[PDB]
Scaffold this motif. Sequence first.
Motif, PDB file in Angstrom:
ATOM      1  N   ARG A   2      -3.698   2.865   3.348  1.00  0.00           N
ATOM      2  CA  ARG A   2      -3.685   2.834   1.856  1.00  0.00           C
ATOM      3  C   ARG A   2      -2.992   4.083   1.315  1.00  0.00           C
ATOM      4  O   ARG A   2      -3.613   5.026   0.869  1.00  0.00           O
ATOM      5  N   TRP A   3      -1.673   4.086   1.334  1.00  0.00           N
ATOM      6  CA  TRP A   3      -0.930   5.269   0.780  1.00  0.00           C
ATOM      7  C   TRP A   3       0.438   4.820   0.247  1.00  0.00           C
ATOM      8  O   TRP A   3       0.700   3.639   0.085  1.00  0.00           O
ATOM      9  N   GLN A  10       1.429   2.304  10.101  1.00  0.00           N
ATOM     10  CA  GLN A  10       0.085   1.689   9.866  1.00  0.00           C
ATOM     11  C   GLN A  10      -1.019   2.598  10.396  1.00  0.00           C
ATOM     12  O   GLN A  10      -0.769   3.699  10.846  1.00  0.00           O
ATOM     13  N   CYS A  11      -2.256   2.154  10.338  1.00  0.00           N
ATOM     14  CA  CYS A  11      -3.383   3.011  10.813  1.00  0.00           C
ATOM     15  C   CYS A  11      -3.511   2.883  12.342  1.00  0.00           C
ATOM     16  O   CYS A  11      -2.926   2.012  12.952  1.00  0.00           O
TER      17      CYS A  11
END
Length: 11
Positions: A2-3, A10-11
């Motif tokens: 979420r940025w 990605q995470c």
Amino acid sequence: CRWLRGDWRQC
């Protein structure tokens, strides 16, 4: 993750 599109992958 979420940025802004100018962050890391990605995470």
